[PDB]
Design a protein around this nucleic acid. Structure first.
Ligand code: MN
Lengths: 98, 218, 342, 343, 98
DNA sequence: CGTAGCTGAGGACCACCAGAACTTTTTTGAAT
DNA sequence: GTTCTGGTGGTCCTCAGCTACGTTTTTTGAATT
């Protein structure tokens, strides 16, 4: 469907293995998406990639210790997105002339 | 009516009376107000552009912000946004500095240029008020539009002055009578900031008696 | 045209309400319980001993957010009323009309007509879809009697005759209202009215529903700009919300009793929730109160279409728009106040 | 602490107030300050961020006692009431009287007599205090004229005649207004009144003070349940507290002109605190406004005695108590409203 | 009306007035919505409140140093939000009995 | 060169404490 | 009891740095809802 989704995490690093969980979660979530803010990623995925990422990521985090939220906008994401500061991000609809 | 100076109406009523005759009645008689996105943007822009106690000059001309003005010919008082004074030995001396300067009223509003009079009338009012204080004549005005970021010139003629006087008389009569009129709805009252209050719907529908009888007898 | 903002009901005893910016915070002996934005709330109902700082009351009463206190069973203990506004034209017209008997009769006729029309429509609706389980012929005869006395009410000219006709309509409607025990056992049988002590079932629900209707009608009347303590009907006892009662006299037929009857028929609640003290009349439990309020709030969000306006809006906006429809009439924008004829 | 006319005023900020048995108990950080009976109370007024106790709120609501929460500066915050709301017959009687000329003129003459008495006594006291720097004969003549005017106004029955007498009295006081100043005459001169875009310095000053007093008066009415926006002499208009203006007429002079004259005569503020405008109008500077507000607050703490009752009260309670008396005139035992006749 | 809006900020605390900017942004964002994770807020607001909040946040923050992103999920926010972790967020449409 | 495992080194983000205060006219403000 | 400004302690969070090695059988996976 090629729809834009956004993922936020919040892992407790004061536990026994918080640092390793943070590292694995960040590494796994960076593969499927592009970082826009600290602990806030956005990506363009279908239903299949979204389901695969959700299944992969629900096994790395530990319940009753972490938080993870996933939002989806839709095919019209170009309207419901606003940037005001000085942290630009690459748009995956650009011809990408590097 | 303490000294006849308390029976004054604000300049803001003129534009409201020009656009939607019921809008002025709701705003200035029933004391009601509701804000939408455009109203918030305009209010924020005007508040940011309201910088008193300071004067900006370029050696020849001068600008004054938030100028309190009143007029007894129309019994209308208010605050002008910007008044510009240009250096030429033709007008009348003003207090604070030396020389003779001519005056031009400029007010900022956010939006496209409107086919209706509206804005123009308000500007004309300011001119009258201004020429009641400095004892001179003003034959020019400027309008600044922020949506397109442009400046538009406006001449002043006798017809505009007569129309302003007539509308001021009508406003005074309506305020004396405490009457809220009814105006044609059209497509205007879709962005009415008081649309949830001025209720354009029940103007065109059937009488209350007919609906009660129809729902009552069967 | 509004959004029908939510409502907050606090039940824990010995709570405390404080203000932080545009947020309300619930504290209890320096232990926080939660915080909610104040731009998504309309009414705050406290149960038992709940305190509020003067800043919160001043911030709420200025922005048309009502605050109500109930002891345990929907009593009228105390409300929060703020300052006035600069719409003296409306209050002047309202008092001038209230000082005149003819206009008060003109409004009372519409009130009673709406009430009895709603009652007749509800009775016919119930008679329509139900099988022989109910007495269809007696209900039809009562509906015919109500429709006949309808036109007599429509052409009234005094408060006393209208009051007598209202009393007759109330007796006639109660005579057939005594019947609804359809999908419940005999413990929920109506046995008359008991005003202060809710000594039986159903009545303990009816009183709470009436209190919840009054606390909303008064808030709406205060919000719209009218004065909710001078009425166009009823014997004008000083120090009562006469206008609120006059306005809810027509909405009580579908907004309070219908809710109780539909909750009884659906068997959402059962008699085990209610209990009795040594005398104690009949009192609800915490779970019963929670279920009642959950069902009430869930019902308040169903969307209907207004008869007069012909526009689609939520159920909970009905008590407000009506009051607004009064105010416009007080400015000469209509011929007479159009009542609710659902 | 002080209770007056079956009402309880708690003026000190940040003081807890709760219930104990059948009495009201004041607290201040676990310190028991006082205990008062509640049997004969009619209303309770708070002036701090207190909040009271829920039990006392319930008790007062059950016993038909209305709690009023006001801020320390006198603004109206909240009014907790039971089923009665208190002001029903009061407000209905106010509306009924407001639409008849005779009772309105009676209340108007009651206000105007107090106004002229206050002005005349102020002039006489000032002339007695400073004989050298004052043209005594002119003040004596205007005092006799004001006395005759008051005697005539005590026999008036029309709104137009009362308005004319008030206008002539204002003209006389304005033509005398300049000379009570005694210092820094270089820039502080009175040459007329213009409330709208004020001109020539000191006038603008006066305007500000007036506004503050008016606001205070409004709160007083909101304390007693009266409607501040429906006047008796002044004709009601949307957005203006006409009855507050009517009530402040007697209190305008000694509470505004005295304050500004005391500010000027002690050189508290100087023309350096005012800015300039090209049309001849003047505006206040933020530091000057803050100093003005601080001086107003300090003056509000001055303690005097009430001419009619004699109880020692601060100035801030003067506008409120008077309003209460007005309410007691609308329904009560008072034959007529007693004005604030203070020597 | 009454749509869900999500706001993410990212201020720089290594500058001169970073702490003050962070405090003011947090106070201005807590006045309208709730907090689900650090440096992210969600609210149920209409269009006028959204415009006012956007104007306030734009006027408060400083450019070329801070970051601010605003997304809107529309009126159908119930079926688009997914939560897996253990940081529940109070809903503002249920009966909300405390 | 790529993928895992450990450090360490500062920026972000929020929660507590402590001290000092808490009052301002009237006017403007959208409409594809 | 709010509101504002400091000051501090503790926790998320990303990057730069340093060592220490990189191979893995064939079979099984949803669907009309
Ligand atoms: Mn402008």
């Amino acid at each position: 469907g090629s729809m834009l989704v956004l993922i936020t995490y919040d892992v407790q690093t004061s536990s026994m293995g918080g640092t390793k969980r943070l590292r694995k979660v960040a590494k796994a979530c960076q593969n499927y998406g592009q970082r826009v803010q600290n602990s806030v990623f956005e990506c363009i995925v279908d239903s299949t990639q979204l389901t695969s990422l959700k299944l992969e990521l629900t096994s790395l985090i530990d319940e009753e210790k972490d938080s993870l939220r996933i939002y989806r906008l839709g095919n019209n994401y170009k309207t419901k997105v606003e940037h005001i500061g000085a942290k630009p991000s690459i748009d995956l609809e650009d011809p990408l002339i590097f | 009516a303490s000294n006849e100076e308390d029976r004054y109406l604000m300049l803001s009523g003129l534009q409201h009376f020009q656009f939607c005759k019921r809008q002025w009645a709701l705003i200035h008689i029933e004391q009601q107000w509701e804000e939408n996105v455009r109203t918030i943007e305009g209010q924020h822009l005007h508040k940011k552009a309201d910088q008193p106690f300071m004067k900006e000059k370029r050696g020849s001309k001068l600008t004054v912000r938030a100028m309190p003005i009143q007029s007894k010919n129309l019994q209308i008082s208010g605050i002008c946004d910007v008044v510009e004074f240009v250096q030429d030995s033709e007008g009348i001396e003003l207090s604070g500095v030396s020389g003779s300067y001519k005056a031009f009223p400029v007010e900022y509003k956010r939006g496209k240029p409107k086919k209706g009079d509206e804005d123009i009338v308000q500007l004309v009012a300011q001119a009258m008020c201004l020429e009641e204080m400095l004892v001179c004549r003003i034959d020019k005005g400027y309008l600044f539009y922020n949506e397109i970021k442009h400046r538009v010139e406006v001449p002043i003629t006798d017809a505009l002055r007569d129309k302003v006087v007539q509308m001021a008389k009508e406003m005074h009569h309506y305020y004396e009578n405490r009457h809220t009129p009814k105006v044609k709805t059209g497509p205007f009252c879709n962005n009415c900031s008081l649309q949830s209050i001025c209720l354009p719907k029940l103007m065109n529908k059937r009488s209350v008696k007919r609906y009660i009888e129809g729902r009552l007898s069967e | 045209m509004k959004k029908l903002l939510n409502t907050l009901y606090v039940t824990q005893p010995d709570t405390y309400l404080s203000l932080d910016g545009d947020n309300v915070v619930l504290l209890k002996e320096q232990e926080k319980l939660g915080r909610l934005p104040l731009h998504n709330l309309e009414a705050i109902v406290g149960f038992g001993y709940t305190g509020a700082s003067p800043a919160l009351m001043g911030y709420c009463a200025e922005r048309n957010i009502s605050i109500t206190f109930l002891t345990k069973n929907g009593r009228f203990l105390a409300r929060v009323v703020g300052e006035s506004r600069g719409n003296v034209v409306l209050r002047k017209t309202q008092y001038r009309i209230s000082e005149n008997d003819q206009e008060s009769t003109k409004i009372a006729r519409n009130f009673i007509t709406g009430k009895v029309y709603n009652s007749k429509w509800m009775l016919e609706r119930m008679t329509r879809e139900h099988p022989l389980r109910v007495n269809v012929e007696q209900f039809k005869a009562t509906s015919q009697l109500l429709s006949v006395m309808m036109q007599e009410i429509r052409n009234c000219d005094s408060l006393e005759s209208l009051r007598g006709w209202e009393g007759q309509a109330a007796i006639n409607y109660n005579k057939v209202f005594d019947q609804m025990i359809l999908q419940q056992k005999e413990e929920f049988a109506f046995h008359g009215r008991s005003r202060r002590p809710p000594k039986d079932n159903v009545n303990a629900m009816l009183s709470f529903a009436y209190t919840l209707l009054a606390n909303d009608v008064a808030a709406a009347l205060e919000t719209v700009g009218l004065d909710a303590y001078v009425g166009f009907m009823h014997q004008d006892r000083p120090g009562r919300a006469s206008l609120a009662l006059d306005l809810m006299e027509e909405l009580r037929g579908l907004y309070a009793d219908r809710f109780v009857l539909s909750l009884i028929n659906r068997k959402e609640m059962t008699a085990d929730g209610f209990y009795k003290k040594e005398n104690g009349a009949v009192l609800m439990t915490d779970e019963a109160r929670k279920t009642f309020l959950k069902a009430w709030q869930t019902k308040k969000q169903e969307k209907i279409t207004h008869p007069y306006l012909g526009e689609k809006m939520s159920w909970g906006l009905v008590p407000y728009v009506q009051a607004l429809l009064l105010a416009r009439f007080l400015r000469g924008d209509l011929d007479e106040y159009p009542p609710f004829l659902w």
